[PDB]
Ligand binder design. Sequence first.
Ligand SMILES: [Zn+2]
Ligand SMILES: [Zn+2]
Ligand SMILES: [Zn+2]
Lengths: 64, 49, 49, 49, 252, 48, 44, 49
Amino acid sequence: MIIPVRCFTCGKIVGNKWEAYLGLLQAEYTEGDALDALGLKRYCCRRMLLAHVDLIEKLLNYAP
Amino acid sequence: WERDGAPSPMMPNEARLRNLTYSAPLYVDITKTVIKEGEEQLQTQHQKT
Amino acid sequence: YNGFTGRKITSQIFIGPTYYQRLKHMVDDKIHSRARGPIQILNRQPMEG
Amino acid sequence: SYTGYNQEDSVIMNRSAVDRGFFRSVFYRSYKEQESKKGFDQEEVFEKP
Amino acid sequence: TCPNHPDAILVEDYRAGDMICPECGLVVGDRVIDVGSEWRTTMSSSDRAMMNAFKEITTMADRINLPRNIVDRTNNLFKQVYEQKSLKGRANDAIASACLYIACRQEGVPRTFKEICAVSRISKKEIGRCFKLILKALETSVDLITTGDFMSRFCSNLCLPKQVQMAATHIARKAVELDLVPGRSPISVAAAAIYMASQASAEKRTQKEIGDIAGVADVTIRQSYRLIYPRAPDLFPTDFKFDTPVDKLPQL
Amino acid sequence: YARPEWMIVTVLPVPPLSVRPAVVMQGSARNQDDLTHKLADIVKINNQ
Amino acid sequence: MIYICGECHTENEIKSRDPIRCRECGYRIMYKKRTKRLVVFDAR
Amino acid sequence: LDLAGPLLAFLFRGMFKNLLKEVRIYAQKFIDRGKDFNLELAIKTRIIS
Ligand SMILES: [Zn+2]
Ligand SMILES: [Zn+2]
Ligand SMILES: [Zn+2]
């Protein structure tokens, strides 16, 4: 639902890169370029953001 | 329809949560004509039965 | 490289990202044991209790 | 074939990945209970015995 | 029944379904408890007549969309009345209609005698006669109805906004509190209050419209409205938005 | 071990309570087994 | 004994005997409030 | 392929027939007494619901 804190494979921090990744994509960055800019070199950490589905955003559309 | 009989629209989630069937009331217009073997005819219709 | 010894594995391994699914079948929902349990009254035979 | 623990359609998982939320899931069980006043002789209500 | 512990409260056990001495450990009875079930974890005339009345009760209920619990309550009233047999002369349909009326009153959602009559072949006069008899036979009583017991149904059936319904309830309750309508039927007071509240909002309902749902002749609504009209500003809630100013409410 | 006359049911046996137990349902309402209902019918006709 | 309305989200104290309904909303779906008892989680 | 429509139309055909079979019975009984009948009371709503 929400971006994992760590990369599952290696434990690298990924929970502080989702908003930065979305911001870069809005800046016309390709997904590969945006991941490179954030320092995600290993394809395990790129997998984390490339495949993340942010369901929490739609979960917040339901009134508590 | 509540206990007091006040109708309210039923959202599907309320039907799921309260275990209510999701049904729509069905109304039919009915025309009733009566003949009294006295060469008189009376036609009455019950709208939305 | 071997995790336990750190030595290169002689054969090179095919490794990459693959999409995996977790199926509803967990072992905890299936593990069950019986040892002098609640027999039935009429049949005097085992039953779930 | 790492340690023989994935043989015959078995899988070796990474414990550290599991520690980080890998394939962690939630199980929701819902129980519904209603109180029925049917029958003057017998009646049931919600209250801690 | 511990042989060592005479009169000992044996403790039930769900592991194997046996009762054990609470302070010895001895299992008295091997697996006798039956844990699984113990814990949740050619028709007689009287029955045939009862069955038809039960069918009639359900048929009446669906016409006005009453919940099954009231129907279940109505069935119990009918069985008590049918068993006691003080209404043997009265028709079963009349008894059932009165039982349906009583069941509604007992549950806090009264239906007026006219509403029960509309769903039954039995007239209001006959239902009222049966209603009193059933109370005597069952030695029971029903709380006196109030003007607010019909606001939800009447206002909703009129498609009036919630604020109007609250305003009408406040008006009707205040009018009874102020004794502006002594002796008037609660339904008439409610109908007049609905008209007063309705005319003060965007959604305006004529006297005929309010009478139809409430079953009160417009003349009676006119009489009650005239009695509460003088104190219109006082009856209305303080925090009420007047689409039509109170000073300009219809006079009649 | 067997005689033709014994085939005719002159005296009807009654199964023990173990064969047909008194089930408990809806509280203390002992739900008699199907055999009990037939046995209750059998005795009523026999007495009549 | 606090119940939260499912529509207006209004906390209201309701007894066991009295009927279940929103004090002001009229909504008949109510949710129990979170327990005040403290439950510990291992962040594992 | 029989979808919800055709399947439900088959049911409604029979249920409406029972409804119209019922109003005949109720209406005829009142007509036999000679008194006029009320259409709304004749209709049994539970049949289709
Ligand atoms: Zn990684
Ligand atoms: Zn002992
Ligand atoms: Zn509410």
